[PDB]
Amino acid sequence: MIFSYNQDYSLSNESSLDEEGKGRVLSRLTELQAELSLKNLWQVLIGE
Amino acid sequence: SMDTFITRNFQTTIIQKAKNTMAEFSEDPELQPAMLFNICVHLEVCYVI
Lengths: 48, 49
Prior knowledge:
This is part of a larger assembly, with two copies of chain A. Chain A has 48 residues and is mainly alpha-helical. Chain A is 48% helix and 8% strand.
């Protein structure tokens, strides 16, 4: 079950995860990434 | 500092288990925030699911 911050994902099985969690996960990821990029904490994560 | 951010955003249990994971992998949580955050998110998503 692969997920990303920019609304991109890859599920091995389709019926394993239905459309509700898929929303909350991407929402949480995007919200977090937003909160990080908002307070300049992304560069430290992207950095080595 | 993300050390504050993670405290604000994530729960206690996540930080505890994440730090326990980083402890078991023999790594300092405070000296490596990125890994702590990655583990925190990676651990949170499971619970979210």
